[PDB]
Design an enzyme around this catalytic site. Structure first.
Site, PDB file in Angstrom:
ATOM      1  N   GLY A   1      -1.511  -1.894   6.104  1.00  0.00           N
ATOM      2  CA  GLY A   1      -2.346  -3.003   6.474  1.00  0.00           C
ATOM      3  C   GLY A   1      -3.506  -2.566   7.307  1.00  0.00           C
TER       4      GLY A   1
ATOM      5  N   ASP B   1      -7.565 -10.322   0.587  1.00  0.00           N
ATOM      6  CA  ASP B   1      -8.349  -9.451   1.455  1.00  0.00           C
ATOM      7  C   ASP B   1      -9.769  -9.967   1.657  1.00  0.00           C
ATOM      8  OD1 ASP B   1      -6.343  -7.696   2.098  1.00  0.00           O
ATOM      9  OD2 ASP B   1      -7.051  -6.012   0.835  1.00  0.00           O
TER      10      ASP B   1
ATOM     11  N   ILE C   1      -1.014  -3.117  -4.063  1.00  0.00           N
ATOM     12  CA  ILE C   1      -1.024  -4.508  -4.590  1.00  0.00           C
ATOM     13  C   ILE C   1      -1.163  -5.560  -3.493  1.00  0.00           C
ATOM     14  CG2 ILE C   1       0.130  -4.003  -6.771  1.00  0.00           C
ATOM     15  CD1 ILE C   1       2.718  -5.115  -5.533  1.00  0.00           C
ATOM     16  N   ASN C   2      -1.525  -5.062  -2.307  1.00  0.00           N
ATOM     17  CA  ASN C   2      -1.724  -5.823  -1.117  1.00  0.00           C
ATOM     18  C   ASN C   2      -0.435  -6.156  -0.376  1.00  0.00           C
ATOM     19  OD1 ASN C   2      -2.975  -6.988   1.070  1.00  0.00           O
ATOM     20  ND2 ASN C   2      -3.450  -8.874  -0.005  1.00  0.00           N
TER      21      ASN C   2
ATOM     22  N   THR D   1       0.843  -1.214   0.000  1.00  0.00           N
ATOM     23  CA  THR D   1       0.000   0.000   0.000  1.00  0.00           C
ATOM     24  C   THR D   1       0.880   1.267   0.000  1.00  0.00           C
ATOM     25  OG1 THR D   1      -1.762  -1.230   1.115  1.00  0.00           O
ATOM     26  CG2 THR D   1      -1.904   1.138   1.174  1.00  0.00           C
TER      27      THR D   1
HETATM   28  N1  LIG Z   1      -4.736  -4.764   0.942  1.00  0.00           N
HETATM   29  C1  LIG Z   1      -5.003  -4.170   2.284  1.00  0.00           C
HETATM   30  C2  LIG Z   1      -3.769  -3.405   2.791  1.00  0.00           C
HETATM   31  C3  LIG Z   1      -2.511  -4.274   2.842  1.00  0.00           C
HETATM   32  C4  LIG Z   1      -1.277  -3.576   3.392  1.00  0.00           C
HETATM   33  O1  LIG Z   1      -1.262  -2.317   3.496  1.00  0.00           O
HETATM   34  O2  LIG Z   1      -0.320  -4.313   3.741  1.00  0.00           O
HETATM   35  C5  LIG Z   1      -6.198  -3.234   2.186  1.00  0.00           C
HETATM   36  O3  LIG Z   1      -6.603  -2.807   1.080  1.00  0.00           O
HETATM   37  O4  LIG Z   1      -6.746  -2.896   3.235  1.00  0.00           O
HETATM   38 CL   LIG Z   2       3.054   5.388   1.707  1.00  0.00          CL
END
Ligand SMILES: N[C@@H](CCC(=O)O)C(=O)O
Ligand SMILES: [Cl-]
Ligand SMILES: *[C@@H]1O[C@H](CO)[C@@H](O)[C@H](O)[C@H]1NC(C)=O
Ligand SMILES: *[C@@H]1O[C@H](CO)[C@@H](O)[C@H](O)[C@H]1NC(C)=O
Ligand SMILES: *[C@@H]1O[C@H](CO)[C@@H](O)[C@H](O)[C@H]1NC(C)=O
Ligand SMILES: *[C@@H]1O[C@H](CO)[C@@H](O)[C@H](O)[C@H]1NC(C)=O
Ligand SMILES: *[C@@H]1O[C@H](CO)[C@@H](O)[C@H](O)[C@H]1NC(C)=O
Ligand SMILES: *[C@@H]1O[C@H](CO)[C@@H](O)[C@H](O)[C@H]1NC(C)=O
Ligand SMILES: [Cl-]
Ligand code: NA
Lengths: 342, 189
Positions: B94, B43, B20-21, B1
């Protein structure tokens, strides 16, 4: 140098990308032009974090009309996806089957159609150069490379660009992204359609499927970024806060802040250890009450979240939760009434 | 993110969070295009995966074709009653994104910390499940004591909690801050 600016500002997570955003503004771009140009660059310098293989949300405020909007360009599950397709975390986290349909480029296109002032290609130009020439690896990427050293070193297609002599790159070492440079160039010249219904499309599908995925050309052809004219807002004092509703976490944010606003926090809330400790205690409890309600959220086109969201943004409801915060103790999980069904 | 904040000369603004997760997403890179593909399917909640000890699935967030997975992302723009932008803020990192975004707002809006301080100030996080309060390494330890004596079990984050980029209007113009936890720096004129 000081980072207070009289006229305009870009805050990105890499210096060069903030600068690229800033130059776009200088050359006459809108805030959207600058955001796209900077995002394209972040996808290179912090390729572990984001990029054209992913998805995004933009919250946009127009100073003239005094209206805010949201652009939803988050990934969607492919058409062949189903509820029980994964049976371990490793299946859902690694390989092609973990891939959702990327929205990034359709999101940039929609935002740019609505708010762009500079030509599409100009937004890509500085990142094409960067990827082709190379750049020193930053702190953030270096730590990410270290963190995933093993998976990267044992995967030759990733090591191709993310290693030097079979070992992950370190801070200071040169990263070049020559294939992405070509891809960015194609995007700049052929537009977004090259990705979704154009010269890149079949190779995308092929790469995803070779790694065990199920994304098809049809998924790409059908992806659409969505304009949301009425984002979530809350009132805080004399301000309004605009943020995205479900499937993002604006409602969680809204609930945290509406819980806490009835405590009337100020500079005094943190001036002594006594006030400070209580203040931070109250913050954590607001977090717990807000996360309790989060498990009812999902994509509002598939799940009815209308009343959940209504509650999570209601000051009255937040006040009900605040009255259950004990100043002398945290509580067990059940106390916060986490819910998995309406 | 990654989070990014922008304010233009005309007073318009963008708050953009992109991902990209997980780090490097799915770990699938195209050898031809160079595109690194997301693992955003992670997710979703899945009925047969035991995510965390004692944490059940969330049926509202199960996979359906065409559905978008739940996200912690929350790119925000705060605007004053006079129509002028006051803060542009959001975060990466996250499940800590939402809490970190809340903290940055609390720190500036209510505690009176300038934007750089609001970004650099130590953070903490609790998301109910799991049932633990995580605090950053340099948090005021009187806070840690206040929490523990109120029966919070705390633990210290081995790295850092989230990454915040922010812009805030001041009498001197637009004050910007990027988070030293990741190494960014703003630019403007
Ligand atoms: N894919 C998660 C975030 C993952 C991350 O920041 O490590 C989200 O959209 O909430
Ligand atoms: Cl950032
Ligand atoms: C998981 O199990 C289900 C039900 O047997 C099956 O349909 C699916 O293909 C499996 N998926 C994987 C990735 O093993
Ligand atoms: C705001 O909208 C108005 C008309 O809807 C337009 O003239 C102006 O360019 C817009 N601003 C931006 C930054 O897009
Ligand atoms: C592009 O567009 C149409 C549907 O929109 C489809 O028939 C055609 O095969 C698509 N081509 C590619 C390369 O995806
Ligand atoms: C906040 O959202 C609500 C419901 O959509 C609505 O009453 C109002 O128009 C919004 N406020 C602003 C300032 O846009
Ligand atoms: C919303 O909040 C009220 C309490 O204020 C409660 O009665 C109701 O069940 C909640 N609705 C939903 C859909 O969770
Ligand atoms: C969660 O942490 C709190 C801290 O006191 C404790 O009361 C509780 O027993 C823990 N476990 C559960 C299941 O709530
Ligand atoms: Cl590349
Ligand atoms: Na700063």
């Amino acid at each position: 140098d000081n980072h207070v600016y009289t006229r305009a500002a870009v805050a990105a997570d890499a210096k060069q990308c903030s600068k690229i955003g800033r130059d776009a503004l200088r050359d006459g771009g809108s805030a959207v032009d600058a955001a796209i140009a900077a995002l394209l660059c972040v996808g290179l310098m912090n390729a572990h974090s984001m990029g054209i293989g992913g998805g995004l949300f933009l919250t946009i405020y127009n100073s003239t009309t005094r209206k805010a909007e949201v652009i939803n360009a988050r990934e969607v599950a492919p058409r062949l996806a189903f509820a029980t397709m994964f049976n371990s975390s490793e299946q859902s986290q690694k390989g092609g089957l973990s891939v959702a349909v990327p929205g990034e480029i359709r999101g940039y296109e929609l935002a740019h159609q609505r708010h762009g002032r500079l030509p599409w290609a100009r937004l890509f130009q500085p990142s094409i150069q960067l990827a082709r020439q190379g750049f020193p690896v930053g702190k953030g990427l270096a730590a990410a490379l270290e963190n995933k050293r093993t998976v990267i070193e044992q995967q030759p297609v990733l090591c191709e660009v993310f290693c030097r002599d079979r070992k992950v790159l370190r801070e200071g070492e040169r990263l070049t992204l020559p294939q992405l440079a070509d891809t960015y160039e194609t995007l700049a010249i052929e537009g977004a359609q090259a990705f979704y219904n154009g010269s890149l499309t079949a190779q995308i599908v092929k790469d995803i499927q070779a790694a065990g995925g199920i994304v098809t050309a049809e998924d790409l052809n059908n992806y659409r970024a969505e304009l949301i004219e009425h984002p979530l807002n809350i009132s805080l004092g004399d301000a309004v806060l605009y943020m995205p509703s479900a499937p993002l976490s604006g409602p969680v944010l809204a609930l945290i802040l509406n819980i806490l606003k009835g405590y009337n926090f100020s500079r005094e809330s943190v001036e002594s250890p006594e006030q400070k400790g209580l203040t931070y205690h109250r913050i954590v409890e607001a977090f717990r009450f807000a996360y309790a309600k989060r498990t009812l959220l999902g994509d509002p086109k598939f799940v009815d979240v209308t009343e959940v969201v209504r509650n999570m943004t209601s000051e009255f409801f937040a006040a009900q939760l605040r009255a259950q915060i004990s100043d002398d103790t945290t509580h067990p999980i059940s106390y916060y009434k986490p819910e998995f069904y309406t | 993110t990654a989070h990014l904040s922008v304010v233009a000369e005309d007073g318009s603004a963008v708050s953009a969070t992109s991902t990209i997760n997980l780090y490097f997403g799915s770990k699938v890179r195209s050898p031809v295009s160079g595109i690194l593909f997301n693992n955003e399917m992670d997710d979703f909640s899945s009925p047969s995966i035991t995510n965390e000890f004692g944490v059940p699935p969330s049926p509202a967030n199960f996979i359906q074709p065409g559905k978008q997975p739940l996200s912690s992302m929350c790119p925000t723009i705060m605007v004053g009653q006079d129509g002028q932008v006051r803060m542009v803020v959001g975060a990466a990192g996250g499940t800590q994104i939402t809490t970190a975004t809340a903290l940055a707002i609390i720190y500036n809006l209510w505690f009176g910390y300038d934007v750089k301080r609001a970004v650099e100030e130590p953070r903490l996080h609790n998301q109910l499940l799991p049932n633990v309060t995580t605090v950053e390494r340099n948090i005021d330890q009187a806070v840690t004591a206040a929490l523990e004596t109120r029966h919070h079990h705390t633990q210290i984050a081995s790295t850092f909690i989230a990454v915040v980029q922010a812009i805030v209007r001041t009498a001197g113009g637009w004050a910007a801050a990027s988070d030293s936890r990741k190494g960014g720096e703003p630019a403007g004129y």
